[PDB]
Design a protein around this ligand. Structure first.
Ligand SMILES: CCCCCCCCCCCCCC(=O)OC[C@H](COP(=O)(O)OCC[N+](C)(C)C)OC(=O)CCCCCCCCCCCCC
Ligand SMILES: CCCCCCCCCCCCCC(=O)OC[C@H](COP(=O)(O)OCC[N+](C)(C)C)OC(=O)CCCCCCCCCCCCC
Ligand SMILES: CCCCCCCCCCCCCC(=O)OC[C@H](COP(=O)(O)OCC[N+](C)(C)C)OC(=O)CCCCCCCCCCCCC
Ligand SMILES: CCCCCCCCCCCCCC(=O)OC[C@H](COP(=O)(O)OCC[N+](C)(C)C)OC(=O)CCCCCCCCCCCCC
Ligand SMILES: CCCCCCCCCCCCCC(=O)OC[C@H](COP(=O)(O)OCC[N+](C)(C)C)OC(=O)CCCCCCCCCCCCC
Ligand SMILES: CCCCCCCCCCCCCC(=O)OC[C@H](COP(=O)(O)OCC[N+](C)(C)C)OC(=O)CCCCCCCCCCCCC
Ligand SMILES: CCCCCCCCCCCCCC(=O)OC[C@H](COP(=O)(O)OCC[N+](C)(C)C)OC(=O)CCCCCCCCCCCCC
Ligand SMILES: CCCCCCCCCCCCCC(=O)OC[C@H](COP(=O)(O)OCC[N+](C)(C)C)OC(=O)CCCCCCCCCCCCC
Ligand SMILES: CCCCCCCCCCCCCC(=O)OC[C@H](COP(=O)(O)OCC[N+](C)(C)C)OC(=O)CCCCCCCCCCCCC
Ligand SMILES: CCCCCCCCCCCCCC(=O)OC[C@H](COP(=O)(O)OCC[N+](C)(C)C)OC(=O)CCCCCCCCCCCCC
Ligand SMILES: C[C@H](CCC(=O)NCCC[N+](C)(C)CCCS(=O)(=O)[O-])[C@H]1CC[C@H]2[C@@H]3[C@H](O)C[C@@H]4C[C@H](O)CC[C@]4(C)[C@H]3C[C@H](O)[C@]12C
Ligand SMILES: C[C@H](CCC(=O)NCCC[N+](C)(C)CCCS(=O)(=O)[O-])[C@H]1CC[C@H]2[C@@H]3[C@H](O)C[C@@H]4C[C@H](O)CC[C@]4(C)[C@H]3C[C@H](O)[C@]12C
Ligand SMILES: C[C@H](CCC(=O)NCCC[N+](C)(C)CCCS(=O)(=O)[O-])[C@H]1CC[C@H]2[C@@H]3[C@H](O)C[C@@H]4C[C@H](O)CC[C@]4(C)[C@H]3C[C@H](O)[C@]12C
Ligand SMILES: C[C@H](CCC(=O)NCCC[N+](C)(C)CCCS(=O)(=O)[O-])[C@H]1CC[C@H]2[C@@H]3[C@H](O)C[C@@H]4C[C@H](O)CC[C@]4(C)[C@H]3C[C@H](O)[C@]12C
Lengths: 240, 240, 240, 240
């Protein structure tokens, strides 16, 4: 709370500021989708690479300004910590070799979430249910890891593409979970060498599906014992 | 409100009128399904092409009559705006070349919805939930568009059939969303050139599915906080 | 209500009677599953064909007895009308040529439903929800029939195996509904001749899925406005 | 209740005891996942086979101790009966030939459930709903067994890989239930010999899916007539 600090704060917390940031994001969005076309990039190539690092600096300025305003509440606000990390990624130069970092630039279009509250509310409601599932996710991951071990010991010999490695089984088992060609592509070929592989996979499909179903039925039915107690006491409220 | 206007209005708003329109629709339905057979079309070919443009004019007459009756309320009633556009399509002649317009004729069997209230009510209940999802659809589309860009930059070089174009990635990613041969057909071939493509697609499958599930759980659980407040206040109603 | 009529009725409505019928059904079940094996059928072949027509006559006797008891209430009780038709099928001899009728014999194992009330209750609860869906099924079938026509006109020329016939499109479209290899197997081959077939199928997948989801959300949420009014009035019951 | 019995009981029922057991389980978990790598097993091979039978004896000791404490309540506590059977499996030596028993060792990582109450509660909630489904599972299994018989009689001749055996049809039908390449892989090849096989499988897909959906809708809606009566009477509670 000072002279220039508060002058800054009026700009950062302003309508024009976020409007402009969003306005820029949508442009850099169309910019980055047009960068897809070599027809475009052959012609108007530099027009966009410049436009990008114009926007990167603006976003860096904007992040710096928001830090001076928000102090510690910036590095505990997830939506800002995202904007920090998602813009810092775009500041690591292409001079560092690793080819994907020039592609991680595009994640800065996710600012359209953190800077638009309609999206922020949806995103929050989806993350809101994850912590209740963290213990069901835990059992599933242990389930996968136990069956990843067994499959790597049972099938990775005669089938190394699918099971020769704990990870290759993890991927394959996750594909069995999606039911993606689990039978025609995996178990039926496995069965023409190991006749009983169906004893492994048919129960695995049963458990990992039946659990996924109860994960949802838990979410719904347990969400609505609350609406049936928040109502109950507010009906017991008005009966004395 | 006049002499002939009101004479017309009794016909348009009548039971016989809609009954006849529906009666015609069902016939032109069987007409258009029999037009499938060359055995039929070789024999009774003209019997149907005539029958069609008999029905088209009747439907044009009927649309004209309904406009004189309903005035502005016809061009704000969606069910009529449909009948308008769906019959106007059938009036663009096959003399205009574009081959599909002779196939868009069949959409005039969707009149059986707009002209039968039992269907109109179902259709209304399905469209009724879309506006609540428009913001979740928005995030998904941005999600797709961000990952469509990245995939087109990561894989369209060595895999142009699947990712060489922002649209080809959009289609492919939508196929990954359906889980349609996402692993055997796409990611496993991708991995034999790009070993880490699973880091791209396994999370994409996670997010785009987990969101689709919460879209439904939102629809159900939020629909029924209303039945638990419309009930609550009607229980608080009768306790004073 | 007589002398022999009532003597009969004590047997038909008895515990031993249904117990024996069920006891027989389970045996003819194992009989018919062992008829699968040629190893068995080569050895104990006649032991079962006899056993079957022993049970068929018993079931015919039992149906005749139940008709004399139940009079008109037998030909309006669905569970009996089933037992009637499902045993009458087993009485059409193999002397009539049509090869499948000797296989329709097996449907007489569905008696284990109609004769065991625990199953009858489940079956009733599943059929119970069908009549509410009959109008949503109606729209879907019209939707399929409209898009079956269009696809047969758009693709059956260059793709007769999938679309050359209104039925072949019906089957294919139902396979697109199941998402069974809809892209790799169907639309992607279609697109290498008709580049815009994705404009046909991607919306078709959208509608026919989005409707299937709302069919369930309708079932759940509407079932439980009843439990929230049967409760409400029974709470308004006790507040005067 | 004695001198040494109660000395033992303080150790078994202690925090350190279960903490140590869990601490060991997590190590033997990483041990067994590293046993996947031949690079590891070539080098530090004996380091783990020893470590395993160190843990097996500790778990045997621990099971023996828990039996002396818990007496009959150990052989009626499912979580212990599991630990008993899951460790007894690891005590059958590899000297008995059957190759899989050395792989069933890994199931002793499921102790991390029975020994961690956060997991035990989830597991209990998932098993909790199974007994309500036991009668719906029963009908499905009879449904499968009836259609497994018919398919083995209809298709196992010209298609022995898929239907030549009651079990091969069971597996195939379960794959049709998963919708795993049911059309492209199974029914479409069947139809190019048996043109009407779609009359078999399209209804089978209908029934076995429609039932699976009602299984869930039953679980949800019936779970919440209870929350709407446990609430109702607790609202009728406070209105006298
Ligand atoms: C914050 C970001 C907001 C973004 C809003 C939408 C921006 C749309 C940018 C369109 C860029 C089109 C690029 C393009 O031409 O793609 C390559 C090919 C032709 O390749 P070429 O080599 O020219 O032949 O041509 C195509 O394949 C055309 C593909 C067009 C895809 C359009 C996707 C629209 C997604 C909308 C997302 C909204 C999120 C809220
Ligand atoms: C209701 C619950 C729903 C979620 C259930 C989750 C079950 C467990 C995760 C399964 C996901 C499958 C992951 C997967 O693709 O595994 C591959 C990796 C890497 O192995 P790698 O050998 O590098 O890749 C094989 C392919 N290759 C050779 C061409 C590179 O394999 C590994 O390295 C092991 C992966 C273990 C993942 C554990 C992550 C932390 C806990 C789970 C968090 C999940 C997201 C919320
Ligand atoms: C408002 C519209 C109401 C429509 C009600 C139903 C109308 C049924 C029209 C039947 C047209 C049959 C055409 C036909 O023969 O299809 C071609 C092939 C034989 O080809 P061909 O070249 O003769 O050898 O033969 C087949 O493939 C026969 C296929 C028969 C399919 C029947 C589909 C019934 C759908 C019912 C929809 C009800 C919606 C409420
Ligand atoms: C819970 C949410 C569920 C819905 C999630 C929706 C996610 C976003 C839409 C994904 C649907 C996939 C669309 C698709 O097939 O994309 C293809 C098009 C055209 O690209 P194009 O390169 O012409 O086609 C490739 C194939 N080829 C070369 C043989 C012609 O690609 C494009 O041109 C871009 C398509 C962008 C669609 C944006 C439409 C407006 C917003 C989304 C509305 C969705 C329906 C309610
Ligand atoms: C949320 C999702 C965020 C985005 C995840 C993207 C994951 C991409 C995984 C992947 O493999 O992408 C490709 C890159 C670079 O290719 P790389 O894997 O280096 O192989 C290049 C092979 N070459 C030279 C013969 C063409 O691979 C890498 O550089 C990834 C290394 C980790
Ligand atoms: C009311 C009816 C109640 C039915 C209860 C269960 C009856 C079980 C009958 C078992 C028949 C086994 C026939 C058999 O051996 O199948 C052929 C092949 C060996 O062929 P082969 O040519 O001998 O070599 O061998 C196999 O593939 C053996 C396959 C065994 C399948 C067992 C399926 C049990 C289903 C239980 C259904 C309960 C419904 C409530
Ligand atoms: C939420 C709703 C879920 C249910 C949505 C149902 C949508 C409509 C039914 C779709 C089911 C697909 C039926 C199907 O496989 O169609 C094939 C038939 C026969 O055509 P056909 O050309 O004989 O068979 C082609 C294959 N071939 C040449 C090797 C014999 O094609 C036909 O002949 C036309 C079939 C029209 C079926 C209309 C049946 C009455 C109304 C729907 C009742 C559905 C069950 C409750
Ligand atoms: C109670 C048990 C708790 C277990 C916690 C997690 C234990 C992690 C153990 C990691 C073992 C890695 C073994 C390994 O190197 O796998 C083989 C290949 C390299 O093969 P190589 O022949 O060395 O070349 O390398 C790979 O493929 C590496 C694969 C790494 C997969 C990591 C999976 C983590 C699952 C976490 C489960 C948590 C459950 C609560
Ligand atoms: C809403 C309900 C959801 C659950 C629905 C369950 C429907 C019935 C079970 C279907 C599961 C499919 C089982 C399966 O893979 O069957 C194969 C077995 C063994 O036949 P087999 O000929 O040995 O294996 C064929 C493959 N080969 C030649 C390479 C070895 O086939 C048999 O031997 C017969 C299997 C009968 C299983 C009956 C088990 C007891 C009742 C069901 C319990 C299910 C788990 C809770
Ligand atoms: C509820 C479900 C009830 C059961 C439905 C079963 C549907 C069976 C459909 C089907 O095609 O089954 C096969 C039979 C007989 O074979 P068929 O279709 O006559 O072809 C025999 C060809 N040959 C002589 C060269 C082997 O085909 C027929 O006989 C069916 C005719 C209708
Ligand atoms: C009980 C099951 C886990 C499986 C099991 O049975 N254990 C878990 C997994 C997801 C959890 C819900 C979500 O977190 C959303 C929400 C957060 C609120 O804060 C409290 C209410 C609610 C509905 C949570 C309740 C409960 O915790 C759920 C159903
Ligand atoms: C909250 C979520 C969106 C995800 C998020 O968490 N944000 C959205 C998506 C679909 C929306 C519902 C539908 O519109 C149907 C209906 C319309 C009524 O008018 C008001 C009630 C109801 C149940 C809506 C509530 C809520 O709006 C929902 C669940
Ligand atoms: C409203 C929707 C149809 C789609 C639409 O919005 N129209 C239809 C399809 C299935 C129908 C339910 C089932 O029949 C089961 C049950 C029968 C009882 O008797 C009355 C209650 C209940 C829950 C029915 C309510 C309603 O009728 C449903 C949800
Ligand atoms: C009615 C249907 C079966 C199909 C049919 O309609 N018959 C069966 C299958 C699963 C059963 C539920 C689960 O067991 C969980 C739970 C156990 C409690 O103890 C009582 C409540 C509840 C919700 C059970 C109610 C009912 O029993 C269900 C819905």
């Amino acid at each position: 709370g000072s002279h220039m600090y508060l002058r800054i704060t009026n700009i950062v917390e302003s309508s024009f500021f976020t409007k402009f940031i969003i306005y820029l994001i949508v442009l850099n969005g169309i910019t980055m989708g047009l960068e897809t076309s070599k027809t475009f990039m052959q012609s108007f190539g530099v027009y966009t690479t410049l436009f990008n690092q114009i926007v990167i600096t603006i976003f860096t300025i904007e992040i710096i300004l928001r830090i001076y305003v928000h102090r510690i509440s910036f590095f505990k606000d997830p939506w800002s910590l995202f904007d920090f990390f998602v813009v810092a990624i775009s500041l690591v130069p292409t001079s560092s070799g690793f080819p994907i970092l020039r592609v991680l630039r595009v994640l800065r279009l996710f600012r359209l979430v953190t800077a638009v509250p309609q999206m922020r509310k949806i995103v929050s409601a989806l993350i809101s249910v994850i912590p209740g599932m963290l213990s069901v996710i835990a059992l599933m991951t242990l389930f996968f890891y136990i069956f990843a071990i067994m499959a790597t010991q049972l099938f990775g010999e005669r089938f190394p593409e699918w099971f020769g490695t704990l990870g290759e089984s993890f991927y394959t088992l996750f594909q069995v979970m999606t039911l993606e060609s689990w039978s025609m592509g995996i178990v039926r070929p496995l069965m023409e060498v190991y006749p009983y592989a169906w004893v492994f996979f048919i129960p695995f499909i049963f458990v990992v599906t039946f659990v996924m179903i109860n994960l949802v039925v838990a979410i719904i039915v347990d969400a609505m014992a609350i609406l049936n107690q928040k109502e109950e006491q507010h009906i017991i409220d008005e009966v004395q």
